Structure 1
Amino acid sequence: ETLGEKWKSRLNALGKSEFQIYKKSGIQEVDRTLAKEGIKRGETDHHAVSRGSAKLRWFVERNLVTPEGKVVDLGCGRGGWSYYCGGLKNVREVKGLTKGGPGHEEPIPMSTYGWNLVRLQSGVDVFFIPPERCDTLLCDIGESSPNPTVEAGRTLRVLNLVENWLSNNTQFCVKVLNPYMSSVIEKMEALQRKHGGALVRNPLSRNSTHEMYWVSNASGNIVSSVNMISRMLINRFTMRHKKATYEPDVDLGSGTRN
């Protein structure tokens, strides 16, 4: 058994209140109140549609992914990553695809900076559509489960999916819903040998998930990067400040790009 698995049982054993307190203990949060109120009226200018943008900004503002040219965002939901890339200096084109429909988030049309570069469709199932050429691949797909084996099945589908989309020296940031299961480690190692990058933990992630993102401009041993984060999450069980710490949202400008 891996350390991640020990962690997952310990999580599932928690009571309802302890769960909600642990989930946000000492993590990082985004001040979203005004951005949401803005959107809940007609406002289309300045706001991120999701806390997803803040999440992507963390990776980029550090040069772990450098989106550019033709960007594909698989499972883009409301559009938080897409709209975010739409205003980055080098990015030429953003295409985003999702499920939508009853029970899922629909794309939300916005006029943030570079909105014209960005094209979103719902009703799409990414697993059965032909791969297209591109320069940067993004993917935030993975529906969590109480059962880590289910999670590994779901994650290995996402991995086989992105492989088919990956070229040569293309930029990427790909959610790995479950990185600790033995079968995922293996696929990740084979994938690292063939495309590079490594796994990195985002501090905006909640303690209730062990997700790590495969980003292109990083290195590090797969096994170590993973165990590091299991030990962290276990350390966080007995924590003694028990509060999230907030940071401002992203302003995404307004207007068309060229």
Structure 2
Amino acid sequence: ETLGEKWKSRLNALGKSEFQIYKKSGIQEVDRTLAKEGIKRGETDHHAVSRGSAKLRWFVERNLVTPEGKVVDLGCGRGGWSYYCGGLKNVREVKGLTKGGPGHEEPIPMSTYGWNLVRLQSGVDVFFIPPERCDTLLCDIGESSPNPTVEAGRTLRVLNLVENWLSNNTQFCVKVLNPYMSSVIEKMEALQRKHGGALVRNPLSRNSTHEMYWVSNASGNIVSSVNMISRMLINRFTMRHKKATYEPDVDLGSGTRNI
């Protein structure tokens, strides 16, 4: 039984009030109030369709992932990672794909800076369409299940999925929902051998998720990197000063971009 499982159980043995408190004990947050209001108001400039923009930004401004050229955003959701990449210097084209439809986040049309370089389409199940060509491959797909083995299965489906989209020196940021389950650990070790990078924990993630992102421009022993998070999450179960620290949201400018 891996350390991460010991955690997942305690997580689950949590009560209504408890869980909610733990979910955010000492984590980083994005101040989205006004941005959400500007959007519900119909604004399409500056605002980020979600908090994923900020989340991606964290990896990007630390060169853990350097999006350039043709960017494919698997499970783009409302557009958070895509609209954000749409403003990055070296980016030429960004194509984001999602299931969408009733009961799922649907892409929000925006006019934020570089928007004209962004193609967003729902009604697409990435697990089956054929692989396209891409310089950078982003993927934030992975549904959380109270059942750790369910998550691991979902994570394996995602790994193999991106495995088919990764050519030789492609930039990537792939959400690895459950990296502690024996079996994902294995797959990851192989994936690392083939396409380098390492797993990295984003401070904007909630404690209720043991998610780590496989980012290209970073090294680190997989087993070692997954355990440092298992311990962190467990330490955070017992907190004093369980408050989150916020930070301003990302401003995505507005208007078109020329090449």
Using the size of structure 2 for normalisation, the TM-score is 0.99
**For residues 6-64 of structure 1, what are the alpha-carbon distances to aligned partners after superposition, in whole Å with 9 as ceiling and x for unaligned?**
00000000111000100010000001111011001121111000000000000011000
Matches within 5 A, 1:22-33: 22-33=22-33
Match of 1:147 in 2: 147
Cα distance in 2 for residues equivalent to 1:42 and 1:20: 31
**For residues 85-108 of structure 1, what are the alpha-carbon distances to aligned partners after superposition, in whole Å with 9 as ceiling and x for unaligned?**
000000000000001111001100
**For residues 196-227 of structure 1, what are the alpha-carbon distances to aligned partners after superposition, in whole Å with 9 as ceiling and x for unaligned?**
00000000000000000000000010000000
Q: CA deviation at 1:188?
A: 0.4
Cα distance in 2 for residues equivalent to 1:42 and 1:123: 23
Q: CA deviation at 1:128?
A: 0.8
Cα distance in 2 for residues equivalent to 1:222 and 1:74: 23
Match of 2:75 in 1: 75
Cα distance in 2 for residues equivalent to 1:106 and 1:169: 31
Q: Which stretches in structure 2 are left out of the alignment for 5+ residues?
A: none
Cα distance in 1 for residues equivalent to 2:98 and 2:8: 29
Q: Which stretches in structure 1 are left out of the alignment for 5+ residues?
A: none
The structure 1 segments of at least 4 consecutive aligned residues displaced by more than 6 Å after TM superposition are none
**Is 1:189 equivalent to 2:169 in the alignment?**
no
Q: Secondary structure at the match of 2:235?
A: helix
Cα distance in 2 for residues equivalent to 1:124 and 1:172: 21
Q: Secondary structure at the match of 1:257?
A: coil
Cα distance in 2 for residues equivalent to 1:181 and 1:41: 43
Cα distance in 2 for residues equivalent to 1:185 and 1:21: 29
Cα distance in 2 for residues equivalent to 1:15 and 1:46: 39
Cα distance in 2 for residues equivalent to 1:128 and 1:215: 23
Q: CA deviation at 1:83?
A: 0.1
Matches within 5 A, 1:1-258: 1-258=1-258
**For residues 174-213 of structure 1, what are the alpha-carbon distances to aligned partners after superposition, in whole Å with 9 as ceiling and x for unaligned?**
0000000111011000110010000000000000000000
Cα distance in 2 for residues equivalent to 1:24 and 1:150: 24
Using the size of structure 1 for normalisation, the TM-score is 0.99
Q: Secondary structure at the match of 2:92?
A: strand
Cα distance in 2 for residues equivalent to 1:140 and 1:225: 19
Cα distance in 2 for residues equivalent to 1:124 and 1:254: 27
Q: CA RMSD in A?
A: 0.4
**For residues 128-177 of structure 1, what are the alpha-carbon distances to aligned partners after superposition, in whole Å with 9 as ceiling and x for unaligned?**
10001110000000001011001011100000000000000100000000
Cα distance in 2 for residues equivalent to 1:37 and 1:241: 29
Cα distance in 2 for residues equivalent to 1:237 and 1:42: 40
Q: Secondary structure at the match of 2:173?
A: strand
% identity of equivalent residues: 100
Cα distance in 2 for residues equivalent to 1:216 and 1:49: 25
Q: Secondary structure at the match of 1:254?
A: coil
Matched residues, number: 258
